[PDB]
Amino acid sequence: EHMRSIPAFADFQEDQLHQQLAQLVKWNNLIARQDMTNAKTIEEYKKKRF
Amino acid sequence: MTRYVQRIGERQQHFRSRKKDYLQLSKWFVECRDSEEAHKLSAVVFGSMTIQHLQLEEATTENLHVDTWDEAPTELTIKPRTVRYREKTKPGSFNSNEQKKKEQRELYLKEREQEKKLIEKYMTQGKITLSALSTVEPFIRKVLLSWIGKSMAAKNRMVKTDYGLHVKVMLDYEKTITLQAEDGNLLMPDATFLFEETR
Amino acid sequence: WFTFVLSFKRVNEPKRELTNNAFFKFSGGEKAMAMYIPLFTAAYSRYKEAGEMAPYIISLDEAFAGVDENNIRDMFEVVEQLGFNYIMNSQALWGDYDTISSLSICELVRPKNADFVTVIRYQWDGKQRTF
Amino acid sequence: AEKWVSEMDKIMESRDNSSGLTFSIAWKPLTAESEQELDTKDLVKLLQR
Amino acid sequence: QRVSPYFVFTSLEKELEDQKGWLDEQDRQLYEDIIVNTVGVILRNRIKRAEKWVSEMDKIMESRDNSSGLTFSIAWKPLTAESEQELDTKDLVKLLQRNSKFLNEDDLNRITKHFQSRIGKAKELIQLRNEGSTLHQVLKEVLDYRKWFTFVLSFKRVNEPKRELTNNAFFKFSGGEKAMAMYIPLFTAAYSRYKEAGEMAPYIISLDEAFAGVDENNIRDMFEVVEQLGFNYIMNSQALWGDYDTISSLSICELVRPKNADFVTVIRYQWDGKQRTFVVDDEHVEELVTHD
Amino acid sequence: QRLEHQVFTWIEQHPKLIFSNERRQEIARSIEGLYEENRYEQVREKLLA
Amino acid sequence: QTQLFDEKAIQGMDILFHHYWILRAEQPEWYQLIREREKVLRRYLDEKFGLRLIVHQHFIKLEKIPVEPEGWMGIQDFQEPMDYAIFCCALAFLEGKAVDEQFLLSELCQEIQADYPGDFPLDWTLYTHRKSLIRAVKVLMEFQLIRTIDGDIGRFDQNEEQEVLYEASTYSRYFMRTYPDDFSSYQHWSELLKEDWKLNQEDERRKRVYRKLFFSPGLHRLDQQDPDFLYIRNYRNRLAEDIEKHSEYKLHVYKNTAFLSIAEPRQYQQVFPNSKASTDIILQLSKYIHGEPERFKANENGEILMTEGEFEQVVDDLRQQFGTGWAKYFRDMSTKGIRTELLRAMKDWMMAEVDSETSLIRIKSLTGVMTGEYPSDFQTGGTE
Amino acid sequence: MMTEAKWVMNRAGLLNFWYYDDEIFPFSDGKLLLRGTNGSGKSVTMQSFLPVLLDGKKSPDRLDPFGSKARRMEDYLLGEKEVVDRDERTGYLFIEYKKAGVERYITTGIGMQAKRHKGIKSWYFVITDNRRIGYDFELAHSQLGDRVPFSAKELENRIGEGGYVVHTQREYMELVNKYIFGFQSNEAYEDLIKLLIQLRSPKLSKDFKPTVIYEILESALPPLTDDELRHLSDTIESMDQTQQQ
Amino acid sequence: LPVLLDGKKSPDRLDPFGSKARRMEDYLLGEKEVVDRDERTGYLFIEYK
Numbered sequence A: 001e002h003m004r005s006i007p008a009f010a011d012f013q014e015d016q017l018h019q020q021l022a023q024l025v026k027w028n029n030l031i032a033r034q035d036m037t038n039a040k041t042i043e044e045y046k047k048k049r050f
Numbered sequence B: 001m002t003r004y005v006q007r008i009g010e011r012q013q014h015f016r017s018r019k020k021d022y023l024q025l026s027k028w029f030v031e032c033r034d035s036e037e038a039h040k041l042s043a044v045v046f047g048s049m050t051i052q053h054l055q056l057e058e059a060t061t062e063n064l065h066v067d068t069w070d071e072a073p074t075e076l077t078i079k080p081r082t083v084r085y086r087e088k089t090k091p092g093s094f095n096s097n098e099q100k101k102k103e104q105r106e107l108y109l110k111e112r113e114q115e116k117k118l119i120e121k122y123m124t125q126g127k128i129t130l131s132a133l134s135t136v137e138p139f140i141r142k143v144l145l146s147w148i149g150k151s152m153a154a155k156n157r158m159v160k161t162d163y164g165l166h167v168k169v170m171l172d173y174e175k176t177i178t179l180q181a182e183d184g185n186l187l188m189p190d191a192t193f194l195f196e197e198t199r
Numbered sequence C: 001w002f003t004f005v006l007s008f009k010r011v012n013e014p015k016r017e018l019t020n021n022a023f024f025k026f027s028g029g030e031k032a033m034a035m036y037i038p039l040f041t042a043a044y045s046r047y048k049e050a051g052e053m054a055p056y057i058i059s060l061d062e063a064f065a066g067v068d069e070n071n072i073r074d075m076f077e078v079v080e081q082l083g084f085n086y087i088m089n090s091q092a093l094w095g096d097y098d099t100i101s102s103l104s105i106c107e108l109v110r111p112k113n114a115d116f117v118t119v120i121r122y123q124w125d126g127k128q129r130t131f
Numbered sequence D: 001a002e003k004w005v006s007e008m009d010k011i012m013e014s015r016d017n018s019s020g021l022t023f024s025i026a027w028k029p030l031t032a033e034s035e036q037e038l039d040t041k042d043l044v045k046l047l048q049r
Numbered sequence E: 001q002r003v004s005p006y007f008v009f010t011s012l013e014k015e016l017e018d019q020k021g022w023l024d025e026q027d028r029q030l031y032e033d034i035i036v037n038t039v040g041v042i043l044r045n046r047i048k049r050a051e052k053w054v055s056e057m058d059k060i061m062e063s064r065d066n067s068s069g070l071t072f073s074i075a076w077k078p079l080t081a082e083s084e085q086e087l088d089t090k091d092l093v094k095l096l097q098r099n100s101k102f103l104n105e106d107d108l109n110r111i112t113k114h115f116q117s118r119i120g121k122a123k124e125l126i127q128l129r130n131e132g133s134t135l136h137q138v139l140k141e142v143l144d145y146r147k148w149f150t151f152v153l154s155f156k157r158v159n160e161p162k163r164e165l166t167n168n169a170f171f172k173f174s175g176g177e178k179a180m181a182m183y184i185p186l187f188t189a190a191y192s193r194y195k196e197a198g199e200m201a202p203y204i205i206s207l208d209e210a211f212a213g214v215d216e217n218n219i220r221d222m223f224e225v226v227e228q229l230g231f232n233y234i235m236n237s238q239a240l241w242g243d244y245d246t247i248s249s250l251s252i253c254e255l256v257r258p259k260n261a262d263f264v265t266v267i268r269y270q271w272d273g274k275q276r277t278f279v280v281d282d283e284h285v286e287e288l289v290t291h292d
Numbered sequence F: 001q002r003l004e005h006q007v008f009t010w011i012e013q014h015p016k017l018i019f020s021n022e023r024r025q026e027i028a029r030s031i032e033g034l035y036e037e038n039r040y041e042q043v044r045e046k047l048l049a
Numbered sequence G: 001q002t003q004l005f006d007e008k009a010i011q012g013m014d015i016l017f018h019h020y021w022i023l024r025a026e027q028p029e030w031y032q033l034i035r036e037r038e039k040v041l042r043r044y045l046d047e048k049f050g051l052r053l054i055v056h057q058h059f060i061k062l063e064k065i066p067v068e069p070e071g072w073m074g075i076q077d078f079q080e081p082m083d084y085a086i087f088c089c090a091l092a093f094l095e096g097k098a099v100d101e102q103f104l105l106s107e108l109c110q111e112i113q114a115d116y117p118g119d120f121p122l123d124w125t126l127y128t129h130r131k132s133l134i135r136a137v138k139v140l141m142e143f144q145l146i147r148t149i150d151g152d153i154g155r156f157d158q159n160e161e162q163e164v165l166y167e168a169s170t171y172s173r174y175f176m177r178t179y180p181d182d183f184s185s186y187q188h189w190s191e192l193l194k195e196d197w198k199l200n201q202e203d204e205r206r207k208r209v210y211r212k213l214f215f216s217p218g219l220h221r222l223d224q225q226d227p228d229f230l231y232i233r234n235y236r237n238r239l240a241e242d243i244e245k246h247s248e249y250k251l252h253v254y255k256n257t258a259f260l261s262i263a264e265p266r267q268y269q270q271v272f273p274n275s276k277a278s279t280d281i282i283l284q285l286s287k288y289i290h291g292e293p294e295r296f297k298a299n300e301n302g303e304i305l306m307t308e309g310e311f312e313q314v315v316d317d318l319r320q321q322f323g324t325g326w327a328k329y330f331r332d333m334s335t336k337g338i339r340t341e342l343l344r345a346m347k348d349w350m351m352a353e354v355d356s357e358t359s360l361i362r363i364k365s366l367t368g369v370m371t372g373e374y375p376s377d378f379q380t381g382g383t384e
Numbered sequence H: 001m002m003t004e005a006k007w008v009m010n011r012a013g014l015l016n017f018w019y020y021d022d023e024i025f026p027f028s029d030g031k032l033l034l035r036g037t038n039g040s041g042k043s044v045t046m047q048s049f050l051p052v053l054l055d056g057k058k059s060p061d062r063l064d065p066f067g068s069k070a071r072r073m074e075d076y077l078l079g080e081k082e083v084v085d086r087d088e089r090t091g092y093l094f095i096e097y098k099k100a101g102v103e104r105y106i107t108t109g110i111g112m113q114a115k116r117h118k119g120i121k122s123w124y125f126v127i128t129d130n131r132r133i134g135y136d137f138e139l140a141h142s143q144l145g146d147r148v149p150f151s152a153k154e155l156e157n158r159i160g161e162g163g164y165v166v167h168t169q170r171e172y173m174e175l176v177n178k179y180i181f182g183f184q185s186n187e188a189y190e191d192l193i194k195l196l197i198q199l200r201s202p203k204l205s206k207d208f209k210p211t212v213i214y215e216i217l218e219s220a221l222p223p224l225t226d227d228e229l230r231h232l233s234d235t236i237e238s239m240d241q242t243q244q245q
Numbered sequence I: 001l002p003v004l005l006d007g008k009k010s011p012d013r014l015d016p017f018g019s020k021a022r023r024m025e026d027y028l029l030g031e032k033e034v035v036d037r038d039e040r041t042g043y044l045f046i047e048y049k
Helices: A014-026 A042-047 B002-013 B019-031 B035-045 B098-122 B138-153 C020-024 C028-048 C069-082 D002-014 D040-047 E005-022 E025-062 E089-097 E105-128 E135-142 E167-172 E175-196 E216-229 E282-290 F002-012 F021-032 F040-048 G007-018 G028-048 G081-096 G105-115 G127-142 G153-158 G190-198 G204-215 G227-234 G236-246 G277-290 G308-321 G335-348 G376-383 H042-049 H073-078 H152-162 H169-181 H186-200 H211-220 H226-244 I024-029
Strands: B074-077 B127-129 B158-160 B166-171 B177-180 B185-188 B191-195 C002-010 C103-109 C118-124 D021-029 E072-078 E149-155 E204-208 E232-237 E252-256 E265-268 G021-023 G053-055 G059-062 G102-104 G146-148 G165-168 G218-220 G249-253 G257-262 G304-307 G352-354 G360-363 G370-373 H007-017 H020-025 H032-035 H088-099 H105-115 H123-127 H164-166
Touching (some): B002 E005, B002 H226, B019 B035, B035 G081, B098 B138, B098 E252, B098 E265, B098 H020, B138 B158, B138 B166, B138 B191, B138 C103, B138 C118, B158 E216, C002 C028, C028 C069, C028 D002, C028 D021, D002 D021, D021 D040, E025 E089, E025 E105, E025 E175, E025 H226, E072 E089, E072 E175, E105 E135, E105 H226, E135 H226, E149 E175, E167 E175, E175 E216, E175 H211, E204 H042, E204 H186, E232 H042, E265 H020, F002 F021, F021 F040, G007 G028, G007 G059, G028 G053, G028 G059, G081 G105, G081 G127, G102 G105, G105 G127, G105 G165, G127 G146, G127 G153, G204 G218, G204 G227, G204 G257, G227 G236, G236 G249, G277 G308, G277 G335, G304 G308, G308 G335, G308 G360, G335 G352, H007 H105, H032 H042, H042 H088, H073 H088, H073 H105, H105 H152, H105 H169, H123 H152, H123 H169, H152 H164, H164 H169, H186 H211
Parallel strands (some): B074 G370, E204 E232, E232 H032, E252 H032
Antiparallel strands (some): B127 B191, B177 B185, C002 D021, C103 C118, E072 E149, E252 E265, G021 G059, G053 G059, G218 G257, G304 G360, G352 G360, H007 H020, H007 H088, H088 H105, H123 H164
16 A cells, blocks of 8 residues: 555555565565454455465 | 463362253153154253233132132123224324313413402502401411411511512511401411512 | 231222222322321220320321321321321421411421521311311 | 231221222231141241140 | 373463463462552542532532521531551541642652551441452442532521531521521522523423421522522422522412322412412413414 | 425415415324325315315 | 352252253353352252352353253254254254364365264255254354354355354363263164253252252143152152242142242343233133033043134134234244144143144143233223 | 533433323423323333433433332333233333533434243434424334334334434443543543442432442542553463462 | 320330430430530420320
């Protein structure tokens, strides 16, 4: 959302976003963990959203 | 954090189970060939969510030796299940008794107008004395007794007619006077009264 | 060991037991009559236990709570019929009731809870309507 | 006590009232729970000796 | 599982060894102190607000003059405990009222000590109350500050000493004065409360048969007080007519449904401070005239 | 019910007509019992009456 | 601190009775109030009934165990044994879910199908099977055993692929009372009663009578020499005094039946008569039976005997007199359908039983307690 | 001068409630003084208006003078069975506010349906568009015969457009606070009303010495909300449980 | 009454049941709090004809 709000990345691809996130974590730059509780749409319950 | 340490303790000390029990009961429900039997069995398992009983109006004779057919039964009037009488879901009208309410106010105010005319008859240039009225109406007797009570209870010597006409009381106590009316006689000390300008 | 049971019979009705529901069906005057005549009859019988010259006395404070103006008239007729000698007090009652053969009154005034009391005296004789 | 309530009942029934409502009173003896007890009325019956 | 005693003994040895490493009493005390300290600050905030409220109550009772030659004032203050086994709340309260400016690390430690004593008292209460009520209830009782302080109502007649309102002191009042003393706290509470309210609020009160017995002059005075405060009210009575000159204007309604009759008849009067006419309500009279 | 609303809006559209309250209740009732008691014909028959 | 049985105790008792159990999160006021008298109530329950009541932090439940289970007692929303079987399977599933765990409806269907212990398989492709599971899930959600917010199973009705996201709530653990032995030793449900009464040997008869009286609208005399009914006669009076002090009821006793009446039923209470028309027709039938005691001879047990044919004639006769005022639902239904429904209904309220084989109808005297009719001006307008 | 513009109460109606067939009462400015023999409803009436009409809680305790649960509001709505042979009614209560120093009126009223020992509905409403019941708005259409009180649906449509209609006491109370009272919290409004019930309770008229007042005041002070104790108690209970384990 | 019938002035004779809520001492003296009169000497007499 906020990358697209910045004009430089209005066309930001979210698959590329998650690729970049995984690369950063792999680059010892970020952390993440799957959400355990907060599902509202069944898809959220499915998708292990980090 | 404290919760987690507490959880470690409970993990050490906890854990029960009852699942398999369900399975025998489910199998029994398989054997339940009719749903009434099944309801009965379920009631065995858990019991009734509620209870069944009938409403009545009053107690009856406690003849243990007699049965209902001998008894006169509880005859009921049944709101017909047809609109053919009146079968209602939407609200009803208020009776609109404006006639009766107007009549009631009229009659009440007319009684009070009679009482007001009576008080006026007894307002002698705005003063009243109990001894001068040794013969009195029942209403005026009660009004004057209320005046005595109001003036003596309230050291302010204030007194009120129900119409808003205020009254302040002049007093004197060495007397024995009698008061006659439709109901009974009373022997009392005397008092004097004057009217104020809250008219 | 025992319990008390009251029974009520409205005119031409079957005997019963004086439950709350039968009470609610009463009118104000019937209600007052049922509650207080029994009590004063209890006092009367107790006095029957008493000697011959005893004045059968009863009392009431805030006399005749929840009773209609008519049966209060009735109460003083009933009292006369029974012959009680009584000392009653009441905040609103005035004792000016035709059924009273005779009755002295006194008014105590102390509104200010201060420690003075003002005393007014009266008397009443009633004119029971002989027809 | 029986004498008191008996005289009570006689008085209450004899005198008629302005309300048209008549009152009568009685003492109900409790009933025995197990057969080792007496109904209180019967107990009083025996007790009168 | 069903295992031999050797396995269970070994398992318990390892587990007790692991479980024993989780915690230490010092960390327990530290955590308890830091949370209790923030709770203590919260309690301080509640005490300060309540103190301002009591100041307002006294201010409102003091800021007018009553026809009886009397002025009222109310006061709040912490009581002294029965004994020091309860560490008397008055010391802690003194510390709490102590200006932050005047505060110092020693006083902070003392306040924390007081809280520590209270938590120990809470646990002991848990043991004595074997009823099994949760620690939350015992805490909510031990720390409820409203029980720690007490009110003292006071009146100062013209050129007479200010006094504390004990029952006996209540008796020193005249009858009307007694009525004011009893029925003023209510007005001052409901008026301060409305002052707490927004700018839309109408100052409402409701009096139920009040003052039956009070001499016409004094109920007059009661209405004078209500006038001074500026209340709007709905009052009901069996004999009260509301023709007292302190009432600037007023509407009196008489209910009628006599003898069990099933319809209620409303007879609407009016008042203007001097006279009470018979009102035929204007708008509804015109409505009766028009609708047909 | 909506048709009933329309019916009494058809009534309420002719102010020169003094449909008393009783006839209005009659109409109300006749509508309330449609096809269980009386077909529409008895309703519009009374309206036409 | 000395509590006494007052309006509050009666209200708490009634709330416990007329609901399966009370949940703290929704009825906190009732829970606290009940808790306040819980002391007097436990003693009292033991004294009169001998029933146990477990009150814990999240809920309170009264194990209303009947003396002899009856069809109406069970969860009425359920209509087949299969519904109960699916309910039990759902319970097993909740045994498989940790507290506050979230599971999909599809997973629940799959595990229930896998575990289902019957010989004849459960298939989710059918409509009826899906309806049974949906009813089970609705009852589950009613007790907050499982919470539900995403979608609505009702679409599952017409779309088996439908999905919803459910969350297993804490109450699943505590829902069912305890069965202290090896449950398998309870080879048949009758063995459960032998447990509850090995626990109630002390003055078993009084507790039996109290349970029978309080649960059922009435208690029917087994025969002319029923020991229980003689027992009831011996302590009818002490029961009446206790009942007047302690409850809404007013006792009635007859030669072949005994029952409790209730004077003022609240919103939450269940009572007969009620809105359902079938009670009205039952009452009309009661009056018709009352009107011919000699043709329909009440037998010694207070019962009135009629054959299915005789009953069908009666139903036709009733449709003739009062049928004009019946709802179009019954007016439009054949005699035999009305017969089946009314007889099931009358069984639910224990008014009568239909012998399956000989078709004999036994109408209990409790049926004869009450009779009903339409207001006279309409009765003359309908069928004078 | 005033602040933003204070409300004033001048009118009060009833419609088919109890024996109150169709009654209304004007207030001089914001003041009114009912009178009549005891047991006639001068109290039931006042209780229905205040603080009942202020928040909408209708449980027996608010109406009941003893504070017990002897008689419900429903009983009043339906009336004594010995007098009215009915087990279903629909009653309307309402008050009509005017903004002091302005010509703006906000109305608030309750609509109830009760069936003798069969269950009581309730719906609340508040009008804020300056419509007045009885001058440019009405509550009972004469259609179908005489004046008939609006049923829930017609009233919901008619107010819904110009004012709000709500079906839960909480929401109604929040609305009333938001518009009329402007309390800095809904809880504070509830506590004020709690104080008001005590103010109204008749022990005042009866008991005359101070120690009653001290208990009343002490009860007026706002206590510890469960959250603040909740954190500490939860932590301490968990820690002591761990120690015991 | 009934105090002057026999003379038992104890609170049980004053209270409608027998409680000690209100006491004879204040009745003789005048209430405790309202007045400082901790001592007095008095007489009470009724006359019968």
